[PDB]
Amino acid sequence: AGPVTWVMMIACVVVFIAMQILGDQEVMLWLAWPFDPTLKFEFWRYFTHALMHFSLMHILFNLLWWWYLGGAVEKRLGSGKLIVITLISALLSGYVQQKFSGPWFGGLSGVVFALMGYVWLRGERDPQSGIYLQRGLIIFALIWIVAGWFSMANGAHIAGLAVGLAMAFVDSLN
């Protein structure tokens, strides 16, 4: 895949390694969404929550989906498209997750739900783009949401999805 795909992926592995060495909480203290308004101008935090992973399983499952769906968007729609999808979903899915359950969360799966959402609807409305998501998967992405409802970031997942559908919509009617 392409530069944005690999970069991200180097970013996540670097940050995971540091969590192994320093501990989750010490990376959390610097990379998590601000828990205190005093911290509101530490602008990296609105994005960096997305680099943190909490087990080998967390990271591998996330990078897998990210490489498959992010690689597809980068190659058919270009590097800038992946950046924008990434920055908006990371910002908005953090925002909603922080309201639902507080600032202590991380992982790329909010961005990934946006990628799932964007790839599916865009595959539906503009087959000419040459991206698509198999049916078997959105329904799965839907059933991963109900088990999280009953320790998943549930607001990150639905807000990510919403951002994905919206942008795809706005991108297809164009």
């Binding site: 989750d24 959390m28 929550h49 997305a50 992973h53 909490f54 967390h58 899915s93 997750q97 359950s101 202590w104 969360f105 991380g106 992982g107 790329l108 799966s109 909010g110 991963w144 999280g148 320790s151 998943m152 970031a153 549930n154 990150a156 997942h157 990510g160």
Partner: peptide, 5 residues
Amino acid sequence: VRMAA
């Protein structure tokens, strides 16, 4: 801590 998943 919640995983985004």
